[PDB]
Write an enzyme that holds these catalytic residues in place. Structure first.
Site, PDB file in Angstrom:
ATOM      1  N   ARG B   7      37.071  44.123  42.384  1.00  0.00           N
ATOM      2  CA  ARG B   7      37.474  44.886  41.218  1.00  0.00           C
ATOM      3  C   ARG B   7      37.640  46.362  41.560  1.00  0.00           C
ATOM      4  O   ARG B   7      36.704  46.993  42.025  1.00  0.00           O
ATOM      5  CB  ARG B   7      36.431  44.752  40.103  1.00  0.00           C
ATOM      6  CG  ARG B   7      36.703  45.539  38.830  1.00  0.00           C
ATOM      7  CD  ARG B   7      35.496  45.670  37.900  1.00  0.00           C
ATOM      8  NE  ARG B   7      35.720  46.727  36.902  1.00  0.00           N
ATOM      9  CZ  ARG B   7      36.432  46.555  35.797  1.00  0.00           C
ATOM     10  NH1 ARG B   7      36.849  45.337  35.428  1.00  0.00           N
ATOM     11  NH2 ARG B   7      36.614  47.571  34.980  1.00  0.00           N
ATOM     12  N   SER B  61      36.026  42.233  34.142  1.00  0.00           N
ATOM     13  CA  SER B  61      36.969  41.374  34.839  1.00  0.00           C
ATOM     14  C   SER B  61      37.022  41.704  36.328  1.00  0.00           C
ATOM     15  O   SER B  61      36.841  42.864  36.744  1.00  0.00           O
ATOM     16  CB  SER B  61      38.358  41.437  34.199  1.00  0.00           C
ATOM     17  OG  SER B  61      39.293  40.646  34.925  1.00  0.00           O
ATOM     18  N   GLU B 110      47.090  36.223  36.143  1.00  0.00           N
ATOM     19  CA  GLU B 110      46.129  37.208  36.623  1.00  0.00           C
ATOM     20  C   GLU B 110      44.950  36.516  37.313  1.00  0.00           C
ATOM     21  O   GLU B 110      44.242  37.168  38.088  1.00  0.00           O
ATOM     22  CB  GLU B 110      45.609  38.135  35.513  1.00  0.00           C
ATOM     23  CG  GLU B 110      46.652  39.089  34.933  1.00  0.00           C
ATOM     24  CD  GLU B 110      47.519  39.823  35.947  1.00  0.00           C
ATOM     25  OE1 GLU B 110      47.007  40.645  36.751  1.00  0.00           O
ATOM     26  OE2 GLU B 110      48.739  39.552  35.930  1.00  0.00           O
ATOM     27  N   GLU B 112      41.853  35.731  36.402  1.00  0.00           N
ATOM     28  CA  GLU B 112      40.697  36.616  36.346  1.00  0.00           C
ATOM     29  C   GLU B 112      39.385  35.832  36.252  1.00  0.00           C
ATOM     30  O   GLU B 112      39.315  34.754  35.682  1.00  0.00           O
ATOM     31  CB  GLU B 112      40.805  37.525  35.125  1.00  0.00           C
ATOM     32  CG  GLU B 112      41.963  38.510  35.236  1.00  0.00           C
ATOM     33  CD  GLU B 112      42.199  39.260  33.931  1.00  0.00           C
ATOM     34  OE1 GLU B 112      41.380  40.104  33.514  1.00  0.00           O
ATOM     35  OE2 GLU B 112      43.193  38.918  33.283  1.00  0.00           O
TER      36      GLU B 112
END
Ligand code: NA
Ligand code: NA
Lengths: 103, 227, 103, 103, 103, 103
Positions: B7, B61, B110, B112
């Site tokens: 991240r 996330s 994405e 995530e």
């Protein structure tokens, strides 16, 4: 009775405060005969000992010496910030009398 | 296992140590129940990124590769001279968003994985620095990271998250598989606002329980033996 | 008084420094009579003991032996990087005299 | 001097190694008179005791018994994988003589 | 020798098991003279003490009383689930004889 | 026997409760002769000591003084919320007699 480490330190001859506001960089401990002691350093190079128990200590200090070594080990391992040390500056390395932790 | 997540975040390592990890918005410290933030995966997942990779509504996330996190980083933090990419162990506070929200996942490309309550410092393996948007490939290791503990853990199974999905009270999802079998009281099933209150209280309970596990892992090393 | 583990180690006969810069791979502890001791290993295979307290030890060392076992257990559990060990090389496994920890 | 738990265990009669490679499932501790002891279990159902100190123990083992109870509590809380136990298998439950942790 | 807290508890008069399966809600510790004790509570309101050492205790229990206070403090701080307590119910609050932790 | 710190504290004349509901801001420890003590502060400025052991303490309190210092150190390091302190207010800073911790 003192309310902080600075006032406590001023009660003794041959002492000074070091303000570190940093975690301990290294911790060394010895069980070798006549060198049953701990040494710590900070990243600035400052080096401090907990003295080998001896005739310079009164009986009431013996348990406190053991406690201080406990405190330094756990502070080292937990990366706890040391605020100040009160040390005796007539020893080499300077000998820890008190520690404060904050922040 | 020893899988990692990644991240990008402008919050530097000193701030993260002080905050006890990578926090969701509105939460200053990891263990601070203080006043309780909204916890809702569906709302988290549909949040828009402005200055931060998704961190609203009680979750933080992450991506499943350094490359993905970096690309996402550059769309958001390209104005920052320095930012960080944190390298994060898998553990059962992490939910794969696509798996939990299923067809209703808002940004499925994405891929995530989101941490309920944020990511504790002890779960952070290390970090890279990124300069203006340019990746420094030097991985700085986190001293407070616990390898044996976290290499023994995986993300949460999706079934632990279906009841936390946080869909609107009257959304179709609550009367469909898999969620129907996990729906909180008031969510598609029989005082207003029950679904929302239960979704929140289930999230809080999850976080309380998870926090206990983290406390146990970290604080057990402050124990100093006597006599 | 020494300021570091290397200088401390050099004060004693039959000692040497091992430089590990690694966490402890295994920790073993025994309560069996006459084998009240700890053993550690590193992933390179190096093996070290904290000796059973005995007549080779002076009274001041007894507390330090107990402390060293405490230190190795918590170092193991916290995955703390061991920098150096000072050991007696006239025992098998080599017997720990001092430890330093730094990242 | 043994260099590992297996060789240590083989020095004693009526012992065996259990290879668990698992964390402790439960920790039980008692202060009740004549049952001042700890009991651990693993998820496979294996049950082990740290014996109440008694006449089967020599004085040097008293401190080691206390240490072992400390070790089992912290191993339990930290979910540390226990590699092996050396136990006396002529007791029920088997009585811990030594522990190793790795992995 | 008992293999679990329930069977241990049944060896004593005036005891019962409480099954809590919950973390400790509060921890209190006192050094006040004649009240050198610990008190814990659970969120259901249940309250338990570790008794002040006294003539109701045999010598072998003194170390175990200290250990139990250590266990309760660290269990409290780590939010470890307490499974069961074995207590004497002829005291108010009920006096802890044994603890089990699992899960 | 009291069931909570408030009732315990009311058993003494020269004591009072302070309600903090806060983590410890700083922890100070001293091994200096005649000042073998700990001092804590809270962010509001409230300052407390664990007294140096002395003739105001009966023998049963000596171990409890040591335990209290252990408790304050680990409470500080874990940022555990202190609920209340029971203190003797004929000392400056106020001297801790008991602590309660709850969220
Ligand atoms: Na993992
Ligand atoms: Na439903």
């Amino acid at each position: 009775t003192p309310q902080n480490i600075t006032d406590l330190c001023a009660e003794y001859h041959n002492t000074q405060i070091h303000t570190l506001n940093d975690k301990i960089f290294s911790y060394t401990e010895s069980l070798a005969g006549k060198r049953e002691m701990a040494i710590i350093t900070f990243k600035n190079g400052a080096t401090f000992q907990v003295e080998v128990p001896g005739s310079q200590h009164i009986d009431s200090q013996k348990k406190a010496i053991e406690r201080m070594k406990d405190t330094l080990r756990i502070a080292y391992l937990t990366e706890a910030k040391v605020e100040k040390l009160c040390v005796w500056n007539n020893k080499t390395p300077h000998a820890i009398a008190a520690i404060s932790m904050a922040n | 296992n020893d899988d990692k997540l990644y991240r990008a975040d402008s919050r530097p390592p000193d701030e993260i140590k002080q905050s006890g990890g990578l926090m969701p918005r509105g939460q200053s410290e990891y263990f601070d129940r203080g006043t309780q933030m909204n916890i809702n995966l569906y709302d988290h997942a549909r949040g828009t990124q402005t200055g931060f990779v998704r961190h609203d509504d009680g979750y933080v996330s992450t991506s499943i590769s350094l490359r993905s996190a970096h690309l996402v980083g550059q769309t958001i933090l390209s104005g920052h001279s320095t930012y960080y990419i944190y390298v994060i162990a898998t553990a059962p506070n992490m939910f794969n968003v696509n798996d939990v929200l299923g067809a209703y996942s808002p940004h499925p490309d994405e891929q995530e994985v989101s941490a309920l309550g944020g990511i504790p410092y002890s779960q952070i393996y290390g970090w890279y620095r990124v300069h203006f948007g340019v990746l420094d490939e030097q991985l700085h290791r986190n001293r407070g990271y616990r390898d044996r503990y976290y290499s023994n853990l995986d993300i949460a199974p999706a079934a632990d998250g279906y009841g936390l999905a946080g869909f609107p009270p009257e959304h179709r999802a609550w009367r469909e598989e898999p969620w129907i079998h996990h729906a909180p009281p008031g969510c598609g099933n029989a005082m207003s606002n029950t679904c929302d209150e239960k979704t929140q209280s289930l999230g809080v309970k999850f976080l309380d329980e998870y926090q206990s596990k983290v406390k146990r892992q970290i604080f057990s090393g402050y124990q100093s033996e006597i006599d």
